[PDB]
Structure formats: C-alpha cells, structure tokens
Amino acid sequence: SPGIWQLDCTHLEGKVILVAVHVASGYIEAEVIPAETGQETAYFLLKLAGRWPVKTVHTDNGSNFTSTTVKAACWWAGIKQEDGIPYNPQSQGVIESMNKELKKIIGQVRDQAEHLKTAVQMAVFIHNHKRKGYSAGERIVDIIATDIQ
Amino acid sequence: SPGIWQLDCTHLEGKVILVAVHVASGYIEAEVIPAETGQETAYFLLKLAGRWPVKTVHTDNGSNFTSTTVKAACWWAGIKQEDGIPYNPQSQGVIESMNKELKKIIGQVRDQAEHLKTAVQMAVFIHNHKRKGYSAGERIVDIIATDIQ
Numbered sequence: 001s002p003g004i005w006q007l008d009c010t011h012l013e014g015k016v017i018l019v020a021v022h023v024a025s026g027y028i029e030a031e032v033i034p035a036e037t038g039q040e041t042a043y044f045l046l047k048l049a050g051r052w053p054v055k056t057v058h059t060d061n062g063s064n065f066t067s068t069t070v071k072a073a074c075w076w077a078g079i080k081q082e083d084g085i086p087y088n089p090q091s092q093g094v095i096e097s098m099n100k101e102l103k104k105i106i107g108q109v110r111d112q113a114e115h116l117k118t119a120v121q122m123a124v125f126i127h128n129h130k131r132k133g134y135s136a137g138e139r140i141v142d143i144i145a146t147d148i149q
Numbered sequence: 150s151p152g153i154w155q156l157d158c159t160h161l162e163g164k165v166i167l168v169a170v171h172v173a174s175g176y177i178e179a180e181v182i183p184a185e186t187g188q189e190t191a192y193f194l195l196k197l198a199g200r201w202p203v204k205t206v207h208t209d210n211g212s213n214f215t216s217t218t219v220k221a222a223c224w225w226a227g228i229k230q231e232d233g234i235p236y237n238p239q240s241q242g243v244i245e246s247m248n249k250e251l252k253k254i255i256g257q258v259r260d261q262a263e264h265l266k267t268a269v270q271m272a273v274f275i276h277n278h279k280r281k282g283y284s285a286g287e288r289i290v291d292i293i294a295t296d297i298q
C-alpha cells in the first residue's frame with residue numbers, strides 16, 4: 001500500500017494533464033504535456049520515482065501499459081508496472097471526482113497565471129494541502145514513515 | 150528544520166541545473182533549465198512547495214533573492230524567502246560536494262539518455278536512494294513525519 005501509485009490522464013485547453021495519485025493518501029503530482037506519449041509518460045515516472053518510493057504503478061491506459069519506453073522507465077526506476085483495470089469499481093469514481101476537483105481548482109486560479117502549467121502546479125499545491133482533518137501531504141508522509149519503521 | 154530548503158544552481162553542457170536541497174536530510178529535487186531566470190526559479194519553487202511542506206527557502210544568489218517573481222512565488226506558496234549567506238562555512242562545502250557528486254552520477258548515466266534532463270532525473274533518483282544506513286529519501290519522510298507527530 002505505501003508504494004502504490006495510479007496514473008491518470010485528463011484534458012484541458014487542448015492540452016494533456018498527466019497525474020500520478022498515491023492511492024492510500026490521495027496525494028498527487030502532475031504535469032502539463034502537449035500529448036500523452038510513452039516518452040512523456042516514461043520521463044514523468046522517472047521523476048516521480050526519484051522523489052517518492054514508487055513500488056507499483058497502475059498505468060492509466062493500455063498504450064502506456066504496452067509502451068516499451070514506459071516499460072524501460074519502470075525497469076530503470078525499479079517500478080512494478082501494472083494495468084489499471086478497476087476491479088474495485090469505486091476506483092473509477094474516485095479518479096473521475098479527482099479530475100473534476102482538479103479542473104475546478106484550475107478554474108479558481110486560472111487568472112493568476114498566463115500559462116496552464118502554472119495553474120496546474122497551483123492546483124497540485126491546493127489539492128495536497130487541503131484538509132479533509134489531515135491533508136494528503138500529511139497522509140503520504142505518515143504512511144511512508146510508518147512503513148519505514 | 151523540517152521545512153528548511155536551500156536552492157543551488159550548477160552548470161553542465163552549457164545548461165543550468167537548478168537544485169533544491171532539504172537541508173536536514175540531503176534529499177533533493179532538480180530540473181534542467183536553459184538559464185536561471187526569476188521566472189524559472191519561481192515556477193520551480195511553486196512545484197516544490199506543492200510536493201513538500203516548504204516553510205523556508207534559502208535562495209541560491211542575490212538575483213533570485215531580489216526577484217519580484219520569486220518573491221511572488223514565495224508569497225503564493227507560503228514560503229519564507231531568505232538569503233543564502235553561509236554563516237556556517239560548512240554550508241559551502243556541503244553544496245559544493247553535492248554538486249560534484251551529482252555531476253559524477255550524471256557522467257555515470259550520461260550514455261543511458263540522449264537528453265541531459267533525463268540524466269539529471271536519474272541522478273536525482275540515485276542520490277535520493279543512496280544509503281549512507283538510511284537514504285536521504287527515508288530521512289526526509291522520517292523528519293517530516295516526526296514533525297507532524
């Protein structure tokens with residue numbers, strides 16, 4: 001559980017927002033990319049795994065699951081690459097609701113930045129700091145620290 | 150101490166590597182940029198603060214300390230912007246040694262990537278996972294978790 005992440009890709013302003021969600025905490029990292037290629041996904045995973053102890057990644061779609069470049073990144077970073085089939089149907093709803101929430105926040109900050117990438121990073125900040133009462137940022141650290149201990 | 154970060158800028162292949170160091174743990178995040186502008190530094194800090202609980206940032210130089218855009222990012226993200234004067238002279242040596250280490254690792258992986266940005270993210274991964282015996286990644290999580298209580 002401490003090392004499980006889920007990839008998620010959503011669209012806004014004719015651009016792609018690639019998101020990684022730490023499943024147990026709801027903590028996210030995200031980036032704006034022109035399009036969702038294996039190369040972009042691979043680079044994103046390399047960054048993620050250098051920053052958090054990523055054991056397992058549930059890929060967002062079959063193309064990224066298939067991608068040799070994504071597989072190569074997972075090999076390099078010591079990540080178990082898995083599919084993203086929602087065996088638990090609640091997974092769908094959670095990701096869908098998160099995408100809605102992220103887009104809402106982006107709208108709330110959109111006039112504070114010229115570029116979408118900036119608005120997305122503001123949304124990441126707000127999402128991770130939001131108290132629901134602990135924040136997702138507090139939860140991920142506590143979960144991982146407990147695992148280390 | 151749990152929320153204290155230091156900025157660091159080093160050069161390689163005619164490009165700029167911007168690094169943030171969590172002082173207490175030695176954990177880093179880094180990016181390659183064409184040049185070190187206030188705008189680039191501001192965006193980097195916005196990303197960092199969305200991902201870790203950044204209380205204080207010691208800026209890497211006077212230009213970034215002065216930069217209204219950097220000040221605006223620190224305001225936005227709730228970061229205390231400070232100077233980077235090494236009142237403790239050991240600070241210099243530590244940053245210098247880290248830059249040497251990072252460049253060494255980049256050299257060790259350089260042929261595994263076409264682009265410097267990729268090599269830098271590999272270096273971030275290796276640096277943060279390296280056992281010195283805990284890793285910097287383990288230390289940062291433990292330090293922050295203990296602070297949260």
Ligand SMILES: O=C(O)CC[C@H]1COc2c(ccc(CNCc3ccccc3C(=O)NCc3ccccc3)c2C(=O)O)O1
Pocket residue numbers: 037039040041042043046069072073074076260261262263264265266267268
């Ligand atoms: O622009 C975007 O899409 C996002 C940015 C780009 C930045 O460059 C890259 C990138 C994504 C991937 C690579 C690796 N390329 C294959 C390669 C070229 C030359 C030598 C070896 C290899 C190799 O297979 N190594 C094993 C490996 C694969 C994937 C990840 C880590 C390690 C680059 C790069 O070559 O630098 O994302």
Ligand SMILES: O=C(O)CC[C@H]1COc2c(ccc(CNCc3ccccc3C(=O)NCc3ccccc3)c2C(=O)O)O1
Pocket residue numbers: 111112113114115116117118119186188189190191192195218219221222223225
């Ligand atoms: O290319 C690079 O250098 C790195 C990428 C760029 C991507 O875009 C940006 C960036 C860095 C900064 C900004 C904000 N610009 C001022 C601005 C423009 C329009 C409206 C408001 C503001 C404003 O002052 N907001 C308060 C604020 C300032 C800095 C940081 C966060 C919040 C952008 C952007 O406008 O989107 O880094």
Ligand SMILES: [Cl-]
Pocket residue numbers: 016034035036037
């Ligand atoms: Cl796409």
Ligand SMILES: [Cl-]
Pocket residue numbers: 156157158159209210
């Ligand atoms: Cl510096």
Ligand SMILES: [Cl-]
Pocket residue numbers: 165183184185186
């Ligand atoms: Cl420069």
